[PDB]
Amino acid sequence: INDYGTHYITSGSMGGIYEYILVIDKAKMESLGITSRDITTCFGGSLGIQ
Amino acid sequence: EEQIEAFKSIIQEKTSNFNAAISLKFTPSLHG
Numbered sequence: 001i002n003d004y005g006t007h008y009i010t011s012g013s014m015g016g017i018y019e020y021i022l023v024i025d026k027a028k029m030e031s032l033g034i035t036s037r038d039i040t041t042c043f044g045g046s047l048g049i050q
Numbered sequence: 051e052e053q054i055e056a057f058k059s060i061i062q063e064k065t066s067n068f069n070a071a072i073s074l075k076f077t078p079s080l081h082g
Contacts, residue, residue: 044067050073
């Protein structure tokens with residue numbers, strides 16, 4: 001079997017083969033996050049007794 | 051490709067004031 005093969009040819013053709021593969025893939029991901037917080041507190045008062 | 055950015059900003063401010071004014075004048079020769 002190893003000397004003469006597992007199979008033999010019964011028919012076919014004698015042509016050529018040209019196989020070209022052009023594969024492309026792209027993945028773009030962007031994430032932007034902005035958080036701003038401001039707080040202000042002011043309290044003042046004067047008293048007068050005389 | 052990898053990109054990361056982080057910004058931080060903190061500001062603090064405090065102000066305090068205090069006054070005290072008291073007068074005394076006693077006159078019932080005597081004067082104050």
